[PDB]
């Protein structure tokens, strides 16, 4: 409304990434949460 139609109020920033099929080594805790993950394709180590 008048201040001394309104659109795009505020500022919005979002990050977009695209999933690619990869082999991931997954570390499983007793809880079952994946504490550590590794991508073989990314590096020789």
């Amino acid at each position, epitope marked *: *409304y*008048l201040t*001394p*139609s309104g659109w795009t109020a505020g500022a919005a920033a979002y990050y977009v990434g695209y999933l690619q099929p990869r082999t991931f080594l997954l570390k499983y805790n007793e809880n079952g949460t994946i504490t550590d993950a590794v991508d073989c394709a990314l590096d020789p180590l």
Partner: antibody
Amino acid sequence: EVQLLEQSGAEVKKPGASVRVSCKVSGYTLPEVAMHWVRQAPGKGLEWMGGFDPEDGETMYAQKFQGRVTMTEDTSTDTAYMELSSLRSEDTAVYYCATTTPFSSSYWFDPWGQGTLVTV
Amino acid sequence: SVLTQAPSVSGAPGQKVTISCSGSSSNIGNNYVSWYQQLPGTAPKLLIYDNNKRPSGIPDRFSGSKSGTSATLGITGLQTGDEADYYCGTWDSSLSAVVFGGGTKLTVL
């Protein structure tokens, strides 16, 4: 921002009648903003009328004119009907459709319907 | 109506002269004031709201003040097209409604 449609276009009612006033909007939707009404007699001044109350959420009615004029609202079609009844001598005059924020702290009439003269 | 403003006032073009409206504590005292302009047979235009705020499209020349129950509408840089009536208004809790003065029709001499 917003342009306002005519308060009731052109209406003529001879004595022994009564007339609704349907004020629509554009660029907003009806129940995001409150309407208002003012009597304006040619060669004369302003007399406020109808109106919505930001406080208490009621649609106000001017006490002096209370009970003679009523208001209804159709939210989707943006049609707000102002029905004045029981025609009298001095009550034929231009009527202005006004809009103020319902957020409160808004007395100024903001956009206008351009006014419509009635007939008694 | 319930407020105080003269029917008409006149001044020479390009000059600086204002118009005031005398209310009460029951109306102007605790409430914000607005001002309106209408040309003959036209749409009354909001001039200043709150006595320090300009609507979109208003020349900055216009200003305003509220001293007690008295509210002046700052009018400067008179133009040949500035002749019209200006209306004071403020919220009323007395009748719990909207009130106005009779209106003051300016004349640019």
